[PDB]
Design an enzyme around this catalytic site. Structure first.
Site, short mmCIF file in Angstrom:
data_model
loop_
_atom_site.label_atom_id
_atom_site.label_comp_id
_atom_site.label_asym_id
_atom_site.label_seq_id
_atom_site.Cartn_x
_atom_site.Cartn_y
_atom_site.Cartn_z
N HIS A 130 38.05 11.87 -36.90
CA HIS A 130 38.28 12.52 -38.19
C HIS A 130 36.94 13.08 -38.74
O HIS A 130 36.92 14.21 -39.23
CB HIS A 130 38.87 11.55 -39.20
N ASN A 143 33.96 22.73 -40.71
CA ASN A 143 32.91 23.22 -41.62
C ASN A 143 31.87 24.09 -40.95
O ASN A 143 31.55 25.13 -41.46
CB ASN A 143 32.21 22.04 -42.28
N1 LIG Z 1 27.97 23.51 -42.06
C1 LIG Z 1 28.10 24.06 -43.29
N2 LIG Z 1 27.45 25.23 -43.59
C2 LIG Z 1 27.57 25.82 -44.79
N3 LIG Z 1 28.27 25.32 -45.78
C3 LIG Z 1 28.95 24.16 -45.62
C4 LIG Z 1 28.89 23.44 -44.35
N4 LIG Z 1 29.63 22.32 -44.47
C5 LIG Z 1 30.18 22.34 -45.72
N5 LIG Z 1 29.70 23.42 -46.41
C6 LIG Z 1 30.02 23.74 -47.79
O1 LIG Z 1 30.53 22.59 -48.44
C7 LIG Z 1 31.85 22.80 -48.93
C8 LIG Z 1 32.61 21.49 -48.86
O2 LIG Z 1 33.03 21.12 -47.52
P1 LIG Z 1 34.31 20.20 -47.47
O3 LIG Z 1 34.06 18.97 -48.33
O4 LIG Z 1 34.57 20.09 -45.97
O5 LIG Z 1 35.48 21.05 -48.16
P2 LIG Z 1 36.20 22.42 -47.64
O6 LIG Z 1 35.81 22.63 -46.20
O7 LIG Z 1 37.64 22.08 -47.87
O8 LIG Z 1 35.57 23.47 -48.57
C9 LIG Z 1 32.35 23.97 -48.06
O9 LIG Z 1 33.33 24.70 -48.77
C10 LIG Z 1 31.13 24.81 -47.84
O10 LIG Z 1 30.81 25.53 -49.08
MG LIG Z 2 35.83 21.13 -44.74
#
Ligand SMILES: Nc1ncnc2c1ncn2[C@@H]1O[C@H](COP(=O)(O)OP(=O)(O)O)[C@@H](O)[C@H]1O
Ligand SMILES: [Mg+2]
Ligand SMILES: Nc1ncnc2c1ncn2[C@@H]1O[C@H](COP(=O)(O)OP(=O)(O)O)[C@@H](O)[C@H]1O
Ligand SMILES: [Mg+2]
Lengths: 362, 354
Positions: A230, A238
């Site tokens: 998970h 992401n």
């Molecule tokens: N590897 C990454 N590179 C750039 N931004 C990221 C990355 N991982 C997460 N983020 C940012 O953090 C936010 C939160 O991620 P997450 O908690 O997985 O929620 P979601 O994917 O539903 O938006 C993403 O919307 C993105 O803005």
């Molecule tokens: Mg996410």
């Protein structure tokens, strides 16, 4: 507050290690021990989180979603306390107990989407975890509490039930020889598949591994593979969204680089993308429940991927961090304990110090 | 002393790097004099009130008593200038001489404070220990801040940079520079040293060099300390190898941030131990060596944070470590991050299972 809730809320949870869990399922004679433990422990965990719930803002608690969660937790606690007068040697009591855990499990099946909806509703008052630190703090505790009761009950069901036996190679849900790289590649594939459906492309995986503990040997630890999958699946979704959107006008995708390292005390997995990164300023916001740069809908948009994956990592004394180079890309890193005996549950306790939680010109 | 009580009543006034440029450009002397004769006593008095909340046996060490007497004398020297007009040219000239004298007087503050912490710990528990870390972060950030102000006035008003600020700081050149200083020390001590492999990305202005407004001496200090760390880790972890893996560095300019990441294959650190790496005096070396005193990490992180950047370490135990510096890319956003002695700082001197 029913009297049984008030009573059991006065104890603190008792955390187990994965070593102890493995030993429970080591054999059949442990069923009476697991029974005697869980019939007391599950009510303590449920009662602690129930008293926390009652501390929330009135407009949150009175949502139908939070009133449902509370009614489920309370019924489950009663169902369990009903077993207190039984002898652990009573084979019919032990059989009935398994059936009861299956019923509690089924009853709690939609707890996460149900809480997440209470949050949504409550978010009426506009109030939010991105802007409300108390809500964030509660949700980490509520959800870690849930992870912990699900883990314990599933262990007993998957070892001792007639009808639900889990993977023959696992002890309950624990793989004492978890092929970490295999779980990486499987989660990567799952993410690839979703990504291709949103974008008609996804990055490739470039994987490296280093066994510091014994060089050139396959990397295995004692672990719960569904938790590991998970975390990986959420970090891959992401990295792939960030990669594809950042690179959309280039002839091809830079791969996602993953390194898996086994060291003496720790197993570490670093996932590196060229998805353009994140300003240091908003890095903390990223782990708040609901925070998303995507529109709300799924690949992304609910904003639970980070904070939930971080709870899985921390649950057994691991961790999850993100370090970004804004303008270029991001490193996401999972740390897991490599020794089952140091893999110890990290549990919230409802006490004075929790209640309280509720100099630089900087 | 009375001046100390009075001036401790004010809260420090933080400056951005943009304001220091703007007010360091023309040759501003009267204004900078008026400002510093008030602001310097305020910052000295603030940290002096804080020293007084420390354990009695630390405050009484000869070393802390030294620091306290120096700070108090400097505050007094400076307060004398409140009776002078900012239009008195002797005064302006005497103020430059006075700052030079305060800078000299404070020259040994860090080793002396560090010595005070030893007399205390040899003379006398982790809650206090945590309090000592919080105090040393604030005490040293406060010195970084007063040294920064005094030095701008000295370099601009006494007899390409604006004082110590380079308005076009060539980040990659400062990286190469600090690397070379580290490599020379490494070679002398270990007989060999890793090479530098450097990459750069200008996200803000593709294809253009990377410059920001910055204090190069600060940036140099941070990089030097992180490279000494990466080099020792590399050499010692690969001691039975015919060669050494390079130290890889990437410099990235994005909209808000300049980031520099330094990667080694020096075998890394257990996660358990990461936080204690930033403890003052914590070192796995004994005690020219590259290591031993245990100030490299916590001090470099204060320099990063002083203008609202940061410095973090993330390690893959068994393999290697990434150290990462973040700096604000905009001069308007590089604003001093300063300790203040208020009830909330005083307040600063279980919910999850152990
Ligand atoms: N590897 C990454 N590179 C750039 N931004 C990221 C990355 N991982 C997460 N983020 C940012 O953090 C936010 C939160 O991620 P997450 O908690 O997985 O929620 P979601 O994917 O539903 O938006 C993403 O919307 C993105 O803005
Ligand atoms: Mg996410
Ligand atoms: N890149 C690195 N890899 C492995 N260990 C490191 C690294 N950087 C720092 N350390 C550890 O952190 C400790 C503290 O670093 P520092 O504060 O620079 O003090 P010193 O170098 O004097 O020991 C080091 O002694 C070393 O054990
Ligand atoms: Mg060092």
């Amino acid at each position: 507050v029913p009297r049984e809730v008030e009573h059991f809320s006065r104890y603190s949870p008792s955390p187990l290690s994965m070593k102890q869990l493995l030993d429970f399922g080591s054999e059949n004679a442990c069923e009476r021990t697991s029974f005697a433990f869980l019939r007391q422990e599950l009510p303590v965990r449920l009662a602690n989180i129930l008293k926390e719930i009652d501390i929330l803002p009135t407009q949150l608690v009175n949502t139908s979603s939070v009133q449902l969660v509370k009614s489920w937790y309370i019924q489950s606690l009663m169902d369990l306390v009903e077993f207190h007068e039984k002898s652990p040697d009573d084979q019919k009591a032990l059989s009935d107990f398994v059936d009861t855990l299956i019923k509690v499990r089924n009853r709690h099946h939609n707890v996460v989407p149900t809480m997440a909806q209470g949050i949504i509703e409550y978010k009426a008052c506009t109030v939010d975890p991105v802007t409300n630190q108390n809500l964030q703090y509660f949700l980490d505790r509520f959800y870690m509490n849930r992870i912990s009761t699900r883990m314990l009950m599933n262990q007993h069901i998957l070892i001792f039930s007639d009808s639900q036996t889990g993977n023959p190679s696992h002890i309950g849900s624990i793989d004492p020889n978890c092929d970490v790289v295999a779980v990486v590649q499987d989660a990567f594939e799952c993410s690839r598949m979703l990504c291709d459906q949103y974008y008609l492309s996804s990055p490739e995986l470039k994987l490296t591994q280093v066994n510091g503990k014994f060089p050139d040997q396959p990397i295995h630890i004692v672990y719960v593979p569904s938790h590991l999958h998970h975390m990986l699946f959420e970090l891959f979704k992401n990295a792939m969204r960030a990669t594809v959107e950042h690179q959309e006008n280039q002839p091809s995708l830079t791969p996602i680089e993953v390194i898996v390292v086994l060291g003496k005390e720790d197993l570490t997995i670093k996932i590196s993308d060229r998805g353009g990164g994140v300003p240091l300023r908003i890095i903390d916001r990223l782990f708040s429940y609901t925070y998303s740069t995507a529109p709300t809908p799924p690949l992304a948009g609910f904003g639970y991927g980070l904070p939930i994956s971080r709870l899985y990592a921390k649950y057994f004394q691991g961790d999850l961090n993100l370090y970004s180079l804004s303008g270029y890309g991001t490193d996401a890193i999972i740390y897991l304990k490599a020794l089952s005996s140091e893999s110890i549950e990290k549990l919230p306790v409802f006490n004075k110090s929790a209640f309280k939680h509720y100099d630089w010109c900087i």
